Amino acid sequence: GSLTEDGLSYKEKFVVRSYEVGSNKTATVETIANLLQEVGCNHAQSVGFSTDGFATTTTMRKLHLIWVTARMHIEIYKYPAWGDVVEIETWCQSEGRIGTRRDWILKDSVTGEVTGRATSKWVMMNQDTRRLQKVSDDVRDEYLVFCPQEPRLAFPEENNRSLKKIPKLEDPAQYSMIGLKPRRADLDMNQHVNNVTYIGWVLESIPQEIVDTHELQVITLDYRRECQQDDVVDSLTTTTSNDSQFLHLLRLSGDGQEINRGTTLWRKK
Amino acid sequence: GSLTEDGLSYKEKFVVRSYEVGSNKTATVETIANLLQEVGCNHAQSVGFSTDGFATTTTMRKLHLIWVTARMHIEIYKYPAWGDVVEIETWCQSEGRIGTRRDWILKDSVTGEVTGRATSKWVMMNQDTRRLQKVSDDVRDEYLVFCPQEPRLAFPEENNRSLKKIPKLEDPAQYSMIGLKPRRADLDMNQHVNNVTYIGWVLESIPQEIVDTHELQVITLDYRRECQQDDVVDSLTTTTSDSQFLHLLRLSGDGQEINRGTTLWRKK
Ligand SMILES: NNC(=O)c1ccc(O)cc1
Ligand SMILES: NNC(=O)c1ccc(O)cc1
């Protein structure tokens, strides 16, 4: 992997592995989401960030502040086949005092064709109290030197699906998968549930018949609260619609506290 | 990745990823087991095998015969850190009419030092009936051309750990993790539970205090029956001692055994 010529974006190639693919011998959306996370990490390391925290500046480490994902939005036109090389380009942008955005473009390394794109919204939070906060001028100044100054968006369109508000699924859900719990492989290097695990859990309540006859085109996921290593989750799904659309909700099995909400768009194969 | 000069083994380098590491920022044993599986696949592809079955020769495809893992044995001296390059060499050997063996050697690409080793036993099974009855004659001649003729073993020592019989854990277990179920990410390209998932499930019943203060050195796992996509598994563990443990995975309902194993851990 490497920073581009101007040092404002980062590119990395990956060979799709045998265990990374589903029934059609192409990479799963969870494999894609792990690769986006990996290229994000390699970009932060290349521009000087420490191994103590992801994209945490010197002032953030001094204040015990971290970046946390608020939303992930991925659109795939073609999933790379087993053995294929996919090239991913990533970059960051400041969004005033709201937080930061990380965008990605996925390409077929042989044809140069764009096969997918993704965007994510990150908010600042105190690591100890879990209280969200706006980005201070000192922090904004320390990371602006690594971001393009003019806007560069993966999703430019005037009213695009990446910024649409997601409603809360009402009981009863059409489909559900109950009692989902993380194992040690679902945790990251800090013993927190990996953000990609939540995508897998959302998709668990999609019926097998949709999975077998449709291709997942778009997934938008809002992150509200964390699943702890000892928590149990229920995944709920209701059809909202050639194309199939679904509304999703992940909540704690006991009290029913929301942890995530999302939408998926699928097209017939 | 590439076949070596003689074409009797295969080597491949991997850069350890951020999501592949645990709390000490080194690769998990499940990441290692996935890499062993990946280098095994790339080796089979490089010597001419097709994409519809792992190491299935022409006669095997005609008879609906597949290779299935009977046992996996892994020993790690040092887990590679996040960002490090690990080089893995793999090769296969025929074991008469019993089945086949696949061995691996893991090395630090910078120092050339051996950091781990693994060995696995594979048996033939009819894919439709699930009957183990495995033969040799035509099949053994079709794959012998890709194996070293003289024995080459990752675990040479006579009466070593990789070939030791594992007893069945007796109730009550000291520790347990109940109601484990696979999700779609646990399945392979054929909608079967990935062999590495079983390693994760075995390790789930090891207490967090052992995981936090010890390093996993050795794991030996016997595969007896598969967990289906709609099955539920209970993971049981009892200390038999360095710390040593005896393991059992069984279906949550009837208690049918799916796996048995042992782990050896050293204090950090
Ligand atoms: N592209 N589809 C996928 O990767 C997918 C992943 C997990 C599911 O439970 C369903 C679908
Ligand atoms: N080296 N340790 C490991 O990779 C490990 C993996 C999963 C566990 O539940 C416990 C330990």
From Swiss-Prot, chain B:
<keyword id="KW-0443">Lipid metabolism</keyword>
<comment type="similarity">
    <text>Belongs to the acyl-ACP thioesterase family.</text>
</comment>
<keyword id="KW-0378">Hydrolase</keyword>
<feature type="active site">
    <location>
        <position position="192"/>
    </location>
</feature>
<keyword id="KW-0276">Fatty acid metabolism</keyword>
<keyword id="KW-0809">Transit peptide</keyword>
<keyword id="KW-0934">Plastid</keyword>
<protein>
    <recommendedName>
        <fullName>Oleoyl-acyl carrier protein thioesterase 1, chloroplastic</fullName>
        <ecNumber>3.1.2.14</ecNumber>
    </recommendedName>
</protein>
<keyword id="KW-0150">Chloroplast</keyword>
<keyword id="KW-0275">Fatty acid biosynthesis</keyword>
<feature type="active site">
    <location>
        <position position="227"/>
    </location>
</feature>
<keyword id="KW-0444">Lipid biosynthesis</keyword>
<comment type="function">
    <text>Plays an essential role in chain termination during de novo fatty acid synthesis. Possesses high thioesterase activity for oleoyl-ACP versus other acyl-ACPs. Substrate preference is 18:1 &gt; 18:0 &gt; 16:1.</text>
</comment>
<dbReference type="GO" id="GO:0009507">
    <property type="term" value="C:chloroplast"/>
</dbReference>
<dbReference type="GO" id="GO:0016297">
    <property type="term" value="F:fatty acyl-[ACP] hydrolase activity"/>
</dbReference>
<dbReference type="GO" id="GO:0006633">
    <property type="term" value="P:fatty acid biosynthetic process"/>
</dbReference>
<feature type="active site">
    <location>
        <position position="190"/>
    </location>
</feature>
